[PDB]
Design an enzyme around this catalytic site. Sequence first.
Site, PDB file in Angstrom:
ATOM      1  N   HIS A  53       0.867  -1.161   0.000  1.00 58.86           N
ATOM      2  CA  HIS A  53       0.000   0.000   0.000  1.00 58.86           C
ATOM      3  C   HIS A  53       0.906   1.212   0.000  1.00 58.86           C
ATOM      4  O   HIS A  53       2.005   1.132   0.525  1.00 58.86           O
ATOM      5  CB  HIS A  53      -0.870   0.042   1.268  1.00 58.86           C
ATOM      6  CG  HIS A  53      -1.836  -1.091   1.377  1.00 58.86           C
ATOM      7  ND1 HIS A  53      -1.486  -2.327   1.884  1.00 58.86           N
ATOM      8  CD2 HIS A  53      -3.154  -1.163   1.082  1.00 58.86           C
ATOM      9  CE1 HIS A  53      -2.547  -3.109   1.898  1.00 58.86           C
ATOM     10  NE2 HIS A  53      -3.576  -2.425   1.423  1.00 58.86           N
ATOM     11  N   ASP A  56       2.113   1.701   3.512  1.00 56.71           N
ATOM     12  CA  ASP A  56       3.073   0.725   3.998  1.00 56.71           C
ATOM     13  C   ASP A  56       4.472   1.300   3.916  1.00 56.71           C
ATOM     14  O   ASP A  56       5.338   0.916   4.696  1.00 56.71           O
ATOM     15  CB  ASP A  56       3.038  -0.558   3.174  1.00 56.71           C
ATOM     16  CG  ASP A  56       1.829  -1.407   3.459  1.00 56.71           C
ATOM     17  OD1 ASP A  56       1.267  -1.323   4.581  1.00 56.71           O
ATOM     18  OD2 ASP A  56       1.451  -2.172   2.545  1.00 56.71           O
ATOM     19  N   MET A  87       2.795  -5.366  -7.653  1.00 60.12           N
ATOM     20  CA  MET A  87       1.475  -4.831  -7.363  1.00 60.12           C
ATOM     21  C   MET A  87       1.504  -3.775  -6.276  1.00 60.12           C
ATOM     22  O   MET A  87       2.181  -3.932  -5.266  1.00 60.12           O
ATOM     23  CB  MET A  87       0.530  -5.983  -6.982  1.00 60.12           C
ATOM     24  CG  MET A  87      -0.891  -5.569  -6.644  1.00 60.12           C
ATOM     25  SD  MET A  87      -1.160  -5.154  -4.889  1.00 60.12           S
ATOM     26  CE  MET A  87      -1.325  -6.791  -4.191  1.00 60.12           C
ATOM     27  N   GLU A 180     -10.730  -6.482  -6.091  1.00 57.64           N
ATOM     28  CA  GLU A 180     -10.711  -7.508  -5.040  1.00 57.64           C
ATOM     29  C   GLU A 180     -11.981  -7.510  -4.186  1.00 57.64           C
ATOM     30  O   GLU A 180     -12.129  -6.689  -3.282  1.00 57.64           O
ATOM     31  CB  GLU A 180      -9.493  -7.299  -4.148  1.00 57.64           C
ATOM     32  CG  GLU A 180      -9.299  -8.349  -3.033  1.00 57.64           C
ATOM     33  CD  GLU A 180      -8.112  -8.022  -2.140  1.00 57.64           C
ATOM     34  OE1 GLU A 180      -7.379  -7.053  -2.441  1.00 57.64           O
ATOM     35  OE2 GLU A 180      -7.876  -8.758  -1.156  1.00 57.64           O
ATOM     36  N   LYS A 182     -14.939  -8.643  -1.411  1.00 59.47           N
ATOM     37  CA  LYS A 182     -14.999  -9.197  -0.061  1.00 59.47           C
ATOM     38  C   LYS A 182     -16.430  -9.004   0.411  1.00 59.47           C
ATOM     39  O   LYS A 182     -16.986  -7.918   0.250  1.00 59.47           O
ATOM     40  CB  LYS A 182     -14.059  -8.427   0.887  1.00 59.47           C
ATOM     41  CG  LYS A 182     -13.930  -9.071   2.246  1.00 59.47           C
ATOM     42  CD  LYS A 182     -13.015  -8.327   3.185  1.00 59.47           C
ATOM     43  CE  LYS A 182     -12.899  -9.112   4.498  1.00 59.47           C
ATOM     44  NZ  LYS A 182     -12.155  -8.377   5.576  1.00 59.47           N
ATOM     45  N   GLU A 216      -9.608 -13.446  -3.492  1.00 63.83           N
ATOM     46  CA  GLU A 216      -8.881 -13.960  -2.334  1.00 63.83           C
ATOM     47  C   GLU A 216      -9.607 -15.169  -1.747  1.00 63.83           C
ATOM     48  O   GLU A 216     -10.804 -15.101  -1.450  1.00 63.83           O
ATOM     49  CB  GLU A 216      -8.757 -12.876  -1.263  1.00 63.83           C
ATOM     50  CG  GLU A 216      -8.051 -13.366   0.011  1.00 63.83           C
ATOM     51  CD  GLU A 216      -7.815 -12.275   1.013  1.00 63.83           C
ATOM     52  OE1 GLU A 216      -7.372 -11.182   0.615  1.00 63.83           O
ATOM     53  OE2 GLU A 216      -8.046 -12.509   2.218  1.00 63.83           O
ATOM     54  N   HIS A 219     -11.890 -14.504   1.342  1.00 64.06           N
ATOM     55  CA  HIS A 219     -13.061 -13.650   1.130  1.00 64.06           C
ATOM     56  C   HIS A 219     -14.284 -14.477   0.716  1.00 64.06           C
ATOM     57  O   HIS A 219     -15.322 -14.433   1.357  1.00 64.06           O
ATOM     58  CB  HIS A 219     -12.753 -12.600   0.058  1.00 64.06           C
ATOM     59  CG  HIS A 219     -11.804 -11.532   0.507  1.00 64.06           C
ATOM     60  ND1 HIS A 219     -11.317 -11.448   1.800  1.00 64.06           N
ATOM     61  CD2 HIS A 219     -11.230 -10.514  -0.178  1.00 64.06           C
ATOM     62  CE1 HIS A 219     -10.474 -10.431   1.888  1.00 64.06           C
ATOM     63  NE2 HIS A 219     -10.407  -9.845   0.704  1.00 64.06           N
ATOM     64  N   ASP A 244      -5.027 -13.828  -4.494  1.00 62.19           N
ATOM     65  CA  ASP A 244      -4.583 -13.841  -3.110  1.00 62.19           C
ATOM     66  C   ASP A 244      -4.853 -15.190  -2.482  1.00 62.19           C
ATOM     67  O   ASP A 244      -6.014 -15.625  -2.350  1.00 62.19           O
ATOM     68  CB  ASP A 244      -5.289 -12.745  -2.293  1.00 62.19           C
ATOM     69  CG  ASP A 244      -4.792 -11.339  -2.639  1.00 62.19           C
ATOM     70  OD1 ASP A 244      -3.760 -11.207  -3.370  1.00 62.19           O
ATOM     71  OD2 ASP A 244      -5.437 -10.379  -2.175  1.00 62.19           O
ATOM     72  N   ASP A 254     -12.284 -12.386   8.838  1.00 61.98           N
ATOM     73  CA  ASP A 254     -11.168 -12.779   7.969  1.00 61.98           C
ATOM     74  C   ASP A 254      -9.977 -13.184   8.838  1.00 61.98           C
ATOM     75  O   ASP A 254      -9.458 -12.374   9.616  1.00 61.98           O
ATOM     76  CB  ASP A 254     -10.748 -11.635   7.039  1.00 61.98           C
ATOM     77  CG  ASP A 254      -9.740 -12.087   5.940  1.00 61.98           C
ATOM     78  OD1 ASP A 254      -9.164 -13.207   6.009  1.00 61.98           O
ATOM     79  OD2 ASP A 254      -9.505 -11.288   4.995  1.00 61.98           O
ATOM     80  N   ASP A 256      -7.069 -14.808   7.536  1.00 62.53           N
ATOM     81  CA  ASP A 256      -5.817 -14.688   6.802  1.00 62.53           C
ATOM     82  C   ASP A 256      -4.810 -15.762   7.205  1.00 62.53           C
ATOM     83  O   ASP A 256      -3.651 -15.452   7.514  1.00 62.53           O
ATOM     84  CB  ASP A 256      -5.191 -13.303   7.020  1.00 62.53           C
ATOM     85  CG  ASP A 256      -5.862 -12.204   6.199  1.00 62.53           C
ATOM     86  OD1 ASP A 256      -6.414 -12.450   5.077  1.00 62.53           O
ATOM     87  OD2 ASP A 256      -5.819 -11.072   6.715  1.00 62.53           O
ATOM     88  N   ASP A 286      -1.676 -13.267   0.711  1.00 64.59           N
ATOM     89  CA  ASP A 286      -2.250 -12.174   1.467  1.00 64.59           C
ATOM     90  C   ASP A 286      -2.712 -12.737   2.795  1.00 64.59           C
ATOM     91  O   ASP A 286      -3.904 -12.946   3.026  1.00 64.59           O
ATOM     92  CB  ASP A 286      -3.416 -11.539   0.688  1.00 64.59           C
ATOM     93  CG  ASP A 286      -3.884 -10.230   1.295  1.00 64.59           C
ATOM     94  OD1 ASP A 286      -3.379  -9.850   2.369  1.00 64.59           O
ATOM     95  OD2 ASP A 286      -4.823  -9.609   0.741  1.00 64.59           O
TER      96      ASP A 286
END
Lengths: 387, 387, 387, 387
Positions: A53, A56, A87, A180, A182, A216, A219, A244, A254, A256, A286
């Site tokens: 991001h 980030d 990405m 993406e 969700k 993902e 998701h 993802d 979620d 992950d 992810d």
Amino acid sequence: MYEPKPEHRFTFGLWTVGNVGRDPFGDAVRERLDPVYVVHKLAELGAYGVNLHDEDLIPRGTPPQERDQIVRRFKKALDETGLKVPMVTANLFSDPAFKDGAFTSPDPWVRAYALRKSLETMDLGAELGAEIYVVWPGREGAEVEATGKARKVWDWVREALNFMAAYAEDQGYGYRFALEPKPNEPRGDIYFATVGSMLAFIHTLDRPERFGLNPEFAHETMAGLNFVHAVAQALDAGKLFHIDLNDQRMSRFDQDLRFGSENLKAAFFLVDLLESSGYQGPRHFDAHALRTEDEEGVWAFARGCMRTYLILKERAEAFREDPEVKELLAAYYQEDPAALALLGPYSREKAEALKRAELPLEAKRRRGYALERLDQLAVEYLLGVRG
Amino acid sequence: MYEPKPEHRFTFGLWTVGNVGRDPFGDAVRERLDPVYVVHKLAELGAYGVNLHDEDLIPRGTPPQERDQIVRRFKKALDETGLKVPMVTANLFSDPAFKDGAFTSPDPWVRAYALRKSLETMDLGAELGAEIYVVWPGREGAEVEATGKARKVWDWVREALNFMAAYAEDQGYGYRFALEPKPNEPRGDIYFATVGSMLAFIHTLDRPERFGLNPEFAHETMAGLNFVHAVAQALDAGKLFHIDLNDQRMSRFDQDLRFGSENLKAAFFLVDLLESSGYQGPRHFDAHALRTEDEEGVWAFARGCMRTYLILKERAEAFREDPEVKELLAAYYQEDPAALALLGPYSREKAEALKRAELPLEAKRRRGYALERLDQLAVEYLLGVRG
Amino acid sequence: MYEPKPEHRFTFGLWTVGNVGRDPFGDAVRERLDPVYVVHKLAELGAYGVNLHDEDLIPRGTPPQERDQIVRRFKKALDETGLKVPMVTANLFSDPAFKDGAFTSPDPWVRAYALRKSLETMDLGAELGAEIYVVWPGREGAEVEATGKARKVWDWVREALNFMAAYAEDQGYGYRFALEPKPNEPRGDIYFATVGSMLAFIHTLDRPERFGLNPEFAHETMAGLNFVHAVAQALDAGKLFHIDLNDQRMSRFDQDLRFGSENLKAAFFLVDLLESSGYQGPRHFDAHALRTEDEEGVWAFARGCMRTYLILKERAEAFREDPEVKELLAAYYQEDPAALALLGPYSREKAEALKRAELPLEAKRRRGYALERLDQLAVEYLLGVRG
Amino acid sequence: MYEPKPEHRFTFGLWTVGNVGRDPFGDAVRERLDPVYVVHKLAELGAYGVNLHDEDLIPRGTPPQERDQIVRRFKKALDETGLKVPMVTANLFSDPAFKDGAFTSPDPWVRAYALRKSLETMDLGAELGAEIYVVWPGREGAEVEATGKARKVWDWVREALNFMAAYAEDQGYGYRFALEPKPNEPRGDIYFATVGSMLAFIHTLDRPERFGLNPEFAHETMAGLNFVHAVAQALDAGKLFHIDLNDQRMSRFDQDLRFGSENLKAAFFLVDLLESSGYQGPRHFDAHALRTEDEEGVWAFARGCMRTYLILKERAEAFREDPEVKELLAAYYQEDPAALALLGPYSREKAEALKRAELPLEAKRRRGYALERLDQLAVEYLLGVRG
């Protein structure tokens, strides 16, 4: 023989291994890691690329002289290591301004902010050599329908995405945009809930060809939907631009989880589907380590993602070449030419023939498809009981 | 003032009030009703139309001399009562031949049978004056992914649906096809799981304009998805061709409950959305009475479906004209012209102005949207505590 | 080396392999099988026993002279084959009288019928040598709370179960009663929804020691709950009297899948838990073949259940003896004696010492539990990549 | 006529209205509020009491001289306002030490810390006049079953709770302990998942009579379970010590919505159940305002919780006295004395009479329970269409 290679195209976001283990009921359990440090770690681990991001790498409010200093220090590390940045994506969820949506905020100042933040992340990505731009609509949803906003959001998000794609055209950026979906979280429901919802949406954009999907695993699985089916639809549409990979127990927040850790069989058939489809994009994990882990556990997490993917890839190849599997599938897909002649493009003469053909109904009503035997065979391959 | 009128366009399938109360763990609790009898009952009750599967009216294997006798007796009753048949659909789920799919069976004899049965139901519907044809893919799914069939089904169902629409063109039928997604049941997962999945699909057909959606409240809700958002996307796309209304508790078997009986608030906002959108199609109650009911409870069920819809329609009108609601929504949707000038079609000069505009971020980060007050008002309208 | 043996105590209900493949949207796809024939098949397959409802053997309304002729012909086959009948249960769900509950019907004639039907099945089982009696409360639930019945059902089901246990005492039957919870289906919600709900209930009965649990994998998994945790609570309470093994994707209709076919890892740890607990009761596969199967597929189904259980039992043994696993667990469960002295039975002197002890908080806040490494090891054992 | 009064016993935790709107994907959107300030606000609002975690009032590491200064300033405000503190609970979830459980940490130093922190909160609550102590096991769960810890946790949490109750006996504290189950979050699965699981547990403690339940609407609803049934089981057992009221859409992260905002009908029957059971404990709104809200929205949230409860209480009274409702229910619960004589305590002479009674099976198989009519009546009351 399960060592990651660059041709595998495994990637990790900075936010994934960099996750400090904070959750809604708990303090951070790990220390914040330096971006240059995790680039060297990932390279050492065999990763092909790192994603990010904007926030980030560059905290909000960083003066545009410190920003360029951060970017160049980061690019040095990429040069040194040979890691790619495939990405990027703007963070459109953390800033409080985005509390009732980014692209779907009722306030046009906030939709303007969201668009600006996105143009800036596009520019950043272009510096780093990114080729895919992901939009995760985390904040684009509702828990209060009394506003009537569900009627407005489709035009709003169309407007943003058309502007983004025209901006890239104008700048000479070669981005493919990967949407993406969700179903919920942080919002009660997120408007763009499913792979299908995003697919339908893309067909309404001005330059649909620049747009595809970033499904993902977790998701779809949150809503109890079947990820393999959703990805097969994405592939059929030629719109799998990114993916993802993680794991998830159905019908909750979620998680992950490390890839392949909960749902082995689904993981198995996902890898089989990606590998046999000639998907060429990144395999992004992810996900993040369990909150019970120190930093050593973080790198065990990272290693296990890639290792599990490679064990499943090999196993899928061996499954597809088993002689009994081939025999079961050949009978499964048995095709009568007499039947095939009644099918295909419309005729009228076909319509008439079909309506008076002698169909072997009784034989078909009694046919067993031997799927219980085939499924058991798949399970025994997974368990490594068969060669 | 909650009496059903023909302009309300309430319809019931034969299979709905005709349901005999059999389930997977239980014998039928009611007697099979005669088609002509339920046509007279529905008319008496105020319904606008009745829908049917082919096998609701004509049992499998009926000789085509008895068939025509059945159709004419049925048409007499429609003439007598003035009921319409707005919608028909082939039953592609009961016959054992369809055990591994109808359009998605690996066996082309079975795909041929499914296509034939559909042409026949199209012919039947034309006789009765049907204008909508629904496809519910109840058998098009999987519980064994080892076949690799998920890669093949998109082409197969494209082929069937293209053939059906060409057949209608050729015959001079004026059908609009309405596709009905469901996430699972009777299959472990159904391939075409969501409104979005069907929308994406339609864009791949030869004559997309003949194809639209039949969303059912219970289907989206089974998967825990938000039905109001899905319908708003269908409406946005101009593809709401029909709608199935009932209720459902999330994350279990399809309950087909009386409309508005469990999820009042969502029912409220669904009626508001259909009514304020100018949706002109049937309001079909694809539901059945509780298994605890005799035949009198069946007609109580039918009456309640229409009555609840009309109470909610009236209440939604009163809600939208409440002065405090209008005041809350006007502030909610406040639009700065200065902000608006940064948005819209791409410029480059806009892209540049946007990137250097002075955005009121601090004010927006502190804005409260007063949605807790608005939601409480909606709840108090529902409860009839406000006028 | 995965051949079923009688000491494995694998059992199948007549209703399991005898399922004809009928569902709520579909005709039967298989032929009804003769009880004597499935007893010989199961025996040939290696099963230890067969279970039955009363109506599996003796259809409702069978005259008590034909009944005894059925029982004796059935007992002959059991004699011939050496199969046991470990468990029986009355069917309290099919009969229409049971439409609003059996034990929880508001009508006392129906609660009387339910109790009678149960006493009769107890008598039948005693003839056949059954030692466990299962109660599945399939009909004991609601979709209409307006009755206020939820306040009444606890006393009603207490009364039935106390009567049944006193009856068995009086008759000299050696039954243990095993209660089988399920969250929903065929009822919107079933009152006794969870293992915990049944456990709590048992403590309110007159002879709690005669009562225990029959948890089913699929039932807990329907609601998205964790079956291994629920069984560990059953085992802790000394109340695991029977167990139903199958598989299930979360948050939908009961699928009754082949054991270990979807959720490998959870199956793995369930087998590990049963086997290392010294559970001595039947391992019942309360499941049925996929509706895509002919009779050959049915026996592939049955073979796969037992085979998968035995593969996972062997693998669990090998996992527990892996030296790295032992090393990780030894560090995981490291116990300081200084810490242990602050714990245990209450003192006051302990309470005072505890309140002023020097706790190593900083070291514990930084401890990593290496659970990501342990989990990856478990996954690699499952995949058979480790020895 | 919906103004909160102190006899209503509405309470709010400091953490509820004091929630700053931070979530896993977003910064805080509100300012931290002062404990004395929220006590005056709640008192102004009509609340009866405020609840607190230890860390709500006293941050970790506060020196025991500043602590006593905080407590006395807080007590002054309670004196001034007349608010009670009915309930306290230790925060056993935020501290990183608790990353793999508090009471169920494998490390005995951490179980010791958890126990100490609890004794300290017990002492604090005694100062403030608290009468209920809640245990929410937020951290007591797993995502890695390979440890085998599920076998150990029952004894560990028994040991903690037995020590806590003995400590209170020894100190002369009059606490009733109220255990609060939750199925998942922040853990993959929480061991004590359901009201039933907690009920079963309590029966294994040394002083069961000191222990009861704190069920939360949202917790049971997360897993898709029926909260009215769970509370009815709690009430039947005499173990409803406290109750947390909010709302929730099924099968996702805990939303902590305003009470009555999503699931009106279920809220309706919950209030009816509490009110008609003579429940005398607090009605706690364990919820928080939507993240879209400023501080004014917080107090709208708070007002709405209490107002909705009071509207539903009044409506439930009116429903129960409707003459048609009374007539439907009287027929619903019709009890034949002849039937009643076959039921009750075991006889043998009853068992024999029952086995040969002439049961009116045909009439019962045909009975309709008119629950569709009753349910529609309930919905029309809720909608305020009936008086």
